[PDB]
Amino acid sequence: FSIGIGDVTPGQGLLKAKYELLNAGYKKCDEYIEALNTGKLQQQPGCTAE
Amino acid sequence: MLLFCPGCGNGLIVEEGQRCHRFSCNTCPYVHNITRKVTNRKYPKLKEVDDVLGGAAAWENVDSTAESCPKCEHPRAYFMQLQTRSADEPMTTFYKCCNAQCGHRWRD
Ligand SMILES: [Zn+2]
Ligand SMILES: [Zn+2]
């Protein structure tokens, strides 16, 4: 029973799987900024804008 | 408000005189007549009515997962991730929530 560095290696088909997620996450998160600046984001909990 | 006297430079307090109320002070002789109307408008900040807390709408915020709960046979499951040090060496713990007609909370 042994462990090497070949055990933990990213797959080529895995690098583009998380690339899509990171791009969609960035595109979705960087919209709420100007959404708040314009005045939006209806709030369910009692809280402040930020 | 804040009113001072031009001659001396001190402040004034209003008190009764002979025929009508007067703007007086205790540092220099200076009295101004009180006439038809003197008043100022103030606007205290009025209270807001607050929100109702709790409900499934609040749980819509955090993301759930797909994992069975051995209490009511539902894939309905909310997951939580927290850090805490155990007795030997730290390991990330996770909380389990059932999104169903029972809705219990466990910590594995
Ligand atoms: Zn004075
Ligand atoms: Zn349950």
Q: How many other C-beta atoms are found inside a 10 Å radius of the C-beta of residue B76? A: 19
| Nearest residue of A to residue B61, measured between CA atoms | A44
Q: Enter the resolution in angstroms.
A: 2.9
Chain B residues whose beta carbon lies within 8 Å of the beta carbon of residue A46 = 50-53
CB B10 within 8 A of CB B27: yes
Method underlying the structure? cryo-EM
Contact call for residues B94 and B79 (beta carbons, < 8 A): yes
Q: What is the DSSP string of A3-31?
A: --TTTS---HHHHHHHHHHHHHHHHHHHH
Ligand nearest to the backbone CA of B105: 2
Asked if A11 has any chain B CB less than 8 Å from its own CB, the reply is: no
- From the CA of B7, the nearest ligand is 1
DSSP state of B106: E
What the block records as the tokens of B15 is 């008190």
Pairwise CA distance, residues B23 & B33, whole Å? 7
Residue B5 annotated as part of some ligand binding site: yes
- Report the CATH fold assignment for B56-107: N-terminal domain of TfIIb (2.20.25)
